[PDB]
């Protein structure tokens, strides 16, 4: 069984269409798998506000996601969160680390999302997510994820100062050209696995690119990861940061690619 949870409340969104992108992704999963999502939060416009303002604004949405994820994780289904922003995971990752202290988190992202209030250049909460879950700063939603159990997958061109925090904490980084299914499998060793994906990990998608070496990850590499993680070891999956307007052709094209990437893991969970 799959439990689908969908964030529709603003959590520090600086992009215009990520709440809409989450809703479109959730709808595609509902239609494909015969599910009904649990929708949490009320939409609000995007803004370039400091994390210290955006975080309290998101408190009601974050607490509601935490409670829904806690119920799902304590049962025996695959927990699937479709999130507008990576920042929703400030509420979910401490629940995962609480319930599965041996779990490895594959944080698949073009960025490291490992800034603290002291290192952030932009003040964006979404760039402070993995560091908050690991306890380098206090989000108000707990921590408890061991940095030794966090693996950044696909991250590249990381600021020297943030890359220093990452190495000091012991977070491993697997850049796109090294992010094969076997490399990711070898990183998780014998642990259960939580997958968090930020779609900016993907190579910009004019896949008319047979003669170019990609800088981002290709959809086929994401699919290969989902194919490689054994169904019995997969705790849950978070899909975040699709910036695509509702009703757009762009959203319909993006969600079809997303369905192709996640199908191996989601099909196997629906078959249990
Ligand atoms: Mg990112
Ligand atoms: Mn991110």
What's the full length of the chain, in residues? 272
Q: Answer whether 155's CB lies under 8 Å from 111's CB.
A: yes
Tokens coding 44: 């609000």
**From residue 203, how far is each of 65, 136, 191, 207, 264 by CA, in Å?**
30, 30, 29, 8, 21
Experimental method for this entry?
X-ray
Q: Is 186 annotated as a binding residue?
A: no
CA of 266 to the centre of ligand 2 (A): 22
Q: Answer whether 156's CB lies under 8 Å from 215's CB.
A: yes
From the number of C-beta atoms within 10 Å of its C-beta (0-12, 13-18, 19+), residue 34 rates as: exposed
How many helices (H) and strands (E) the chain has is answered by 9, 8
Q: How many CA atoms lie within 13 A of 120 on its CB side?
A: 20
Q: Answer whether 176's CB lies under 8 Å from 214's CB.
A: yes
**Rg, C-alpha atoms of the chain:** 17
Coil, helix or strand at residue 79 = strand
Spatial distance between the Cα atoms of 260 and 271, rounded to a whole number of angstroms? 17
CA of 113 to the centre of ligand 1 (A): 7
1 alpha carbon, distance to own chain's centre = 20
Spatial distance between the Cα atoms of 65 and 6, rounded to a whole number of angstroms? 8
Q: Which of 258, 241, 248, 272 is nearest to 31 (CA)?
A: 258
Spatial distance between the Cα atoms of 143 and 134, rounded to a whole number of angstroms? 5
CA of 232 to the centre of ligand 1 (A): 28
CA of 154 to the centre of ligand 1 (A): 10
85 alpha carbon, distance to own chain's centre = 8
Spatial distance between the Cα atoms of 115 and 138, rounded to a whole number of angstroms? 12
- For 61, the enclosing helix (H) or strand (E) is helix 59-74
CA of 110 to the centre of ligand 2 (A): 7
Bridge partner residues of 196 (DSSP): 107, 238
Q: Which of 85, 185, 103, 116 is nearest to 145 (CA)?
A: 103
Protein residues within 5 Å, CB atom, of ion ligand 2: 86, 109, 113, 198
Tokens coding 61: 């949405």
Contacts of 246 (CB under 8 A, 6+ apart): 17, 20, 23, 24
Interruption sites in the chain after residues (C→N beyond 2.5 Å): none
Q: Answer whether 134's CB lies under 8 Å from 169's CB.
A: yes
**114 alpha carbon, closest ligand:** 2
Q: Which of 1, 11, 2 is nearest to 83 (CA)?
A: 11
Spatial distance between the Cα atoms of 40 and 8, rounded to a whole number of angstroms? 6
Distance, first Cα to last Cα, the chain: 7
CA of 15 to the centre of ligand 1 (A): 12
Coil, helix or strand at residue 6 = strand
Q: Is 141 annotated as a binding residue?
A: no
CA of 272 to the centre of ligand 1 (A): 32
Q: Is 267 annotated as a binding residue?
A: no
Task: State the resolution, in angstroms.
Answer: 1.8
CA of 34 to the centre of ligand 2 (A): 28
**154 alpha carbon, closest ligand:** 1
Spatial distance between the Cα atoms of 138 and 207, rounded to a whole number of angstroms? 40
Q: Is 109 annotated as a binding residue?
A: yes
β-pairing, 193-198 vs 38-40, is unpaired
């Amino acid at each position: 069984m799959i439990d689908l949870i969908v964030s529709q409340g603003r959590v520090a969104d600086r992009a215009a269409w990520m709440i809409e992108g989450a809703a479109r992704t959730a709808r595609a999963l509902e239609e494909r798998y015969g599910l009904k999502g649990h929708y949490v939060g009320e939409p609000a416009p995007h803004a370039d506000d400091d994390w210290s303002v955006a975080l309290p604004q998101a408190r009601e949405t974050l607490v509601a996601v935490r409670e829904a994820a806690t119920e799902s994780i304590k049962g025996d289904n695959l927990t699937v969160l479709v999130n507008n922003t990576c920042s929703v995971s400030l509420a979910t990752l401490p629940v995962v680390a609480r319930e599965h202290p041996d779990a490895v988190v594959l944080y698949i992202d073009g960025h490291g999302d490992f800034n603290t209030p002291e290192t952030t250049d932009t003040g964006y909460l979404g760039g402070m997510v993995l560091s908050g879950a690991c306890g380098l700063w206090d989000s108000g939603h707990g921590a408890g994820l061991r940095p030794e159990q966090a693996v950044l997958v696909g991250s590249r061109d990381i600021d020297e100062g943030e890359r220093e925090l990452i190495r000091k904490a012991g977070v491993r980084v697997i850049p796109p050209g090294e992010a094969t299914a076997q490399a990711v499998l070898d990183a998780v060793k014998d642990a259960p696995v939580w997958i968090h994906i930020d779609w900016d990990v993907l190579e910009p998608g004019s896949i008319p690119a047979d003669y170019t070496v990609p800088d981002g990850m290709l959809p086929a590499q994401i699919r290969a990861v989902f194919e490689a993680i054994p169904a019995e070891r997969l705790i849950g999956v978070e899909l975040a940061e699709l910036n695509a307007p509702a009703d757009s052709e762009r959203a319909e094209q993006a969600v079809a690619v997303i369905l192709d990437m996640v199908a191996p893991a989601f099909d196997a969970a629906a078959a249990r």
